């Protein structure tokens, strides 16, 4: 329940009127907190962070770089559940996809490189072809 720790850390930043950069750093501290978690706890931390990022109280111009930062640790991180959570990720990028577009481009660079090097050539080019890159 560092799940819960970050959960209410962010439920009370929901209750904050902090500024652009300031509140950004608040969420960034809570991010890097969840980053430095370890395992299944860190996994549901991912879960709950992005469940945080869903709102408009979380701005789009917030979640831009907040989840950019959520992301740029992931190249460093294990591959199995990285595929897993890129899947769930993209499934939940579904709503305002253009809010996520470039970030998705990179997610799927990573993810398709996984399938490529996992030789899951099907799901590789398949789930590459999910994207409207320039057609977004």
- Interface contacts to other proteins, rule CB under 8 A: 17, 19-20, 56, 60, 95-96, 98
Give the E-state strand segments of 1-136 in sequence order: none
How far apart are CB 96 and other proteins at their closest, in Å? 5
Question: Nearer to other proteins by C-beta: 23 or 71?
Answer: 23
Question: Nearer to other proteins by C-beta: 119 or 134?
Answer: 134
How far apart are CB 134 and other proteins at their closest, in Å? 13
**Cβ neighbours for 124, distance < 8 A, ≥ 6 positions apart:** 112, 114, 115, 116, 118
Contact 115, 127 (CB under 8 A): yes
How far apart are CB 19 and other proteins at their closest, in Å? 7
Question: Nearer to other proteins by C-beta: 18 or 78?
Answer: 18
Question: Nearer to other proteins by C-beta: 45 or 104?
Answer: 104
**How far apart are the C-alpha atoms of 46 and 42, rounded to whole Å?**
6
Q: Which residue has the tokens 């959570």?
A: 85
């Amino acid at each position: 329940r560092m799940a819960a720790a970050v959960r209410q850390d962010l439920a009370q930043l929901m209750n904050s009127s902090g500024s652009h950069k300031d509140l950004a750093g608040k969420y960034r501290q809570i991010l890097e907190k969840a980053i430095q978690l370890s395992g299944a706890e860190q996994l549901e931390a991912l879960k709950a962070f992005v469940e945080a990022m869903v709102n408009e109280n979380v701005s789009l111009v917030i979640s831009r770089q907040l989840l950019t930062d959520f992301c740029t640790h992931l190249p460093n991180l294990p591959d199995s559940t990285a595929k897993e959570i890129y899947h769930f990720t993209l499934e939940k990028i579904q709503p305002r996809v253009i809010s996520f577009e470039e970030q998705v481009a990179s997610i799927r660079q990573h993810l398709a490189s996984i399938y490529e090097k996992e030789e899951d050539w099907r799901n590789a080019a398949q789930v590459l072809v999910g994207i409207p890159l320039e057609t977004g």
